[PDB]
Amino acid sequence: MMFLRQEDFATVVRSTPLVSLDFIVENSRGEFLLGKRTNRPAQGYWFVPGGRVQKDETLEAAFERLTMAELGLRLPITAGQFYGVWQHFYDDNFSGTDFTTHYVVLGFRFRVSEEELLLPDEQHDDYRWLTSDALLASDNVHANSRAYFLAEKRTGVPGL
Amino acid sequence: MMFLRQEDFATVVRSTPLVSLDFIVENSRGEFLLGKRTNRPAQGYWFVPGGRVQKDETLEAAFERLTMAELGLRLPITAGQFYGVWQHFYDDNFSGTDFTTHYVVLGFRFRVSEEELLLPDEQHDDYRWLTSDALLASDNVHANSRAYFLAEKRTGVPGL
Ligand SMILES: Nc1nc2c(ncn2[C@@H]2O[C@H](COP(=O)(O)OP(=O)(O)O)[C@@H](O)[C@H]2O)c(=O)[nH]1
């Protein structure tokens, strides 16, 4: 557990990869959860929910913290199916356009009931449940979220 | 690609997880490579070779840089069998005992010919090739290296 003050978060983002968990969440209709991001990077794009692991935080603890923060429902890591190690590179950062952000991302897939989520408004100003076909066809869904649904992008992803 | 100044590496290690690749390296007789570490963390322990991924460095590029740096032989990531995601927590760091180090680690296994390595002396002052049974019985092999030969404090799948 360590949420960093902004100065040290800036130095971290400038200097090293972030490590994060992305949640590929399915409902009862075979559709997947995307939120319209309010923060950089990938600001304004539809994206799966996800976030970074903190210093000295286990993956197990991060999964609980992040599902609760992103989805409004605390789930244990055993609820998730590990879905590979991905790499996301952005030209901007949480607080500006002056340096890049790099994430190494652990994907997890799971199915939920919509009524058990309490979707928060901090990181997204709208949410939708999209079919694979629809999300792949939309250039407003960021490429790094579309990639989870493309066979060609899964090739050579460690863990798949 | 970004090798950090010590000042920046210290801020990074204090503040966030490192992401690294560890190499489970087999020879033609089924033994595995361990080096006797000269740097913190895990200083003085026998450990598999491995190291961290830098800012804006792909896993593919890191794998080539790190195999060359650790083994003296450059191999592509396609040569490696993904061997799980692991989490390693140390009470010390490269610079001393003032803060902890946290790694999220991707394991990769592959076989080499001993005669094709050029084992470097920067990070290890000796190297041995041990059977799985032998290294598991040796307490001078760090617990975090022994874990690759059991069992699972492991996230995800061995490839294949
Ligand atoms: N100051 C500060 N902000 C953080 C830290 N970690 C994440 N954030 C920010 O908190 C918000 C949510 O974090 P997260 O879901 O991990 O980021 P995401 O990659 O933008 O979805 C974003 O605006 C992040 O930039 C941190 O340790 N310190």
Ligand SMILES: Nc1nc2c(ncn2[C@@H]2O[C@H](COP(=O)(O)OP(=O)(O)O)[C@@H](O)[C@H]2O)c(=O)[nH]1
């Ligand atoms: N100054 C500096 N040292 C680094 C950096 N990355 C790794 N090191 C050090 O370089 C050496 C080899 O790095 P690596 O194999 O990644 O780390 P290991 O976990 O100690 O095997 C170790 O002494 C590390 O502490 C960095 O960006 N800057």
Ligand SMILES: [Cl-]
């Ligand atoms: Cl050999």
Ligand SMILES: [Mg+2]
């Ligand atoms: Mg997030």
Ligand SMILES: [Mg+2]
């Ligand atoms: Mg190393």
